[PDB]
Write an enzyme that holds these catalytic residues in place. Structure first.
Site, PDB file in Angstrom:
ATOM      1  N   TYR A  19       0.857  -1.212   0.000  1.00 50.53           N
ATOM      2  CA  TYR A  19       0.000   0.000   0.000  1.00 50.53           C
ATOM      3  C   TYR A  19       0.884   1.251   0.000  1.00 50.53           C
ATOM      4  O   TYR A  19       0.488   2.283  -0.576  1.00 50.53           O
ATOM      5  CB  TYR A  19      -0.925  -0.055   1.214  1.00 50.53           C
ATOM      6  CG  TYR A  19      -1.122  -1.453   1.740  1.00 50.53           C
ATOM      7  CD1 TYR A  19      -1.524  -2.480   0.902  1.00 50.53           C
ATOM      8  CD2 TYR A  19      -0.862  -1.760   3.066  1.00 50.53           C
ATOM      9  CE1 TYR A  19      -1.686  -3.772   1.374  1.00 50.53           C
ATOM     10  CE2 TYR A  19      -1.025  -3.045   3.556  1.00 50.53           C
ATOM     11  CZ  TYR A  19      -1.437  -4.055   2.706  1.00 50.53           C
ATOM     12  OH  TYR A  19      -1.598  -5.320   3.189  1.00 50.53           O
TER      13      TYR A  19
ATOM     14  N   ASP B   1      -7.068 -12.746   6.548  1.00 53.11           N
ATOM     15  CA  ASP B   1      -5.596 -12.771   6.403  1.00 53.11           C
ATOM     16  C   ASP B   1      -4.937 -12.863   7.773  1.00 53.11           C
ATOM     17  O   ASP B   1      -3.906 -12.214   7.939  1.00 53.11           O
ATOM     18  CB  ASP B   1      -5.094 -11.560   5.613  1.00 53.11           C
ATOM     19  CG  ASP B   1      -3.751 -11.805   4.953  1.00 53.11           C
ATOM     20  OD1 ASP B   1      -3.457 -12.981   4.653  1.00 53.11           O
ATOM     21  OD2 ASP B   1      -3.017 -10.822   4.754  1.00 53.11           O
TER      22      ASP B   1
END
Ligand SMILES: Nc1ncnc2n[nH]cc12
Length: 259
Positions: free
Chosen positions: A14, A118
């Site tokens: 990101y 996750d």
């Protein structure tokens, strides 16, 4: 009001996460840095649904240009990952405390209909008191809304942790994937290695496990009680898989280990 950026925390896909320190109050926070032009909305509006003491607290978001600024809890003990020494793991009482708070969080999330998708030691951060926090809801989504479950069909997470049915089925229930990844953390936690690369028929180590050959490299290092619980979690048909309330009833989980 103004936040000095002290050092890096984790250089993610990101962009980056940085320690941030308030000039007046000296309070330290972490600022995940999303340059949209080099999804981030859902992650933000998920963060506004969250408030628990085993989940990274979410503060606010400065909207400067396209460089999104994510104002989150500082976790000064860093990553559950860096307390697993390779091939040994950690002390079995340390495992239980961490698995208790993993369960506190997953219960709390599952309570509000969101699934993380996750869970892995890299996404469990520890504060000054080694208190575990679930972190990064970038792949997290709503799976229950108005008390109607929605089935998942999007494949994602990290392979070795991901649940078998995320690869053989087209739709699948969000909570048992989460039950499966926390057990791969249990197993990391107790053995210091991951059992297989992915929960596949093509994968030898998962073939063995299903054949119950538990005299092999990670399971041999795990005591009969926690290994009894892992036989209940890492069940291939997610319909027979132990659910979190049953995990809470299990012998190992309720065993007194740590002062
Ligand atoms: N990578 C990280 N290290 C410390 N604290 C954090 N909070 N959110 C992400 C973090």
């Amino acid at each position: 009001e103004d936040w000095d950026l002290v050092q890096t925390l984790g250089e993610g896909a990101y962009g980056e996460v940085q320690l941030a320190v308030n000039r007046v109050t000296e309070e330290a926070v972490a600022v995940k840095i999303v340059d949209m032009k080099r999804n981030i909305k859902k992650e933000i509006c998920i963060n506004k649904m969250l408030n628990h003491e085993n989940v990274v607290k979410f503060y606010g978001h400065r909207r400067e240009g396209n460089i999104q600024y994510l104002f989150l809890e500082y976790c000064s003990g860093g990553e559950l990952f860096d307390r697993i020494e390779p091939d040994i793991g950690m002390p079995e009482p340390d495992a239980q405390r961490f698995f208790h708070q993993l369960m506190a969080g997953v219960v709390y999330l599952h309570g509000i209909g969101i699934t993380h998708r996750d869970i892995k030691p890299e996404n469990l951060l520890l504060d000054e008191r080694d208190n575990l926090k679930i972190s990064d809801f970038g792949l997290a989504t709503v799976f229950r809304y108005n008390n109607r479950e929605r089935l998942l069909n999007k494949m994602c997470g990290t392979l070795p942790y991901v649940a078998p049915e995320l690869l053989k089925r087209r739709e699948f229930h969000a909570e048992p994937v989460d039950v499966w990844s926390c057990g791969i953390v249990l197993t990391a936690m107790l053995a210091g290695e991951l059992p297989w690369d992915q929960p596949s028929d093509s994968c030898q180590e998962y073939s063995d496990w299903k054949e119950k050959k538990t005299y092999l490299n990670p399971w041999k290092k795990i005591d009969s009680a926690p290994l009894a619980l892992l036989h209940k979690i890492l069940v291939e048909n997610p319909s027979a898989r132990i659910t979190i309330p049953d995990i809470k009833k299990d012998r190992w989980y309720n065993k007194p280990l740590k002062k």
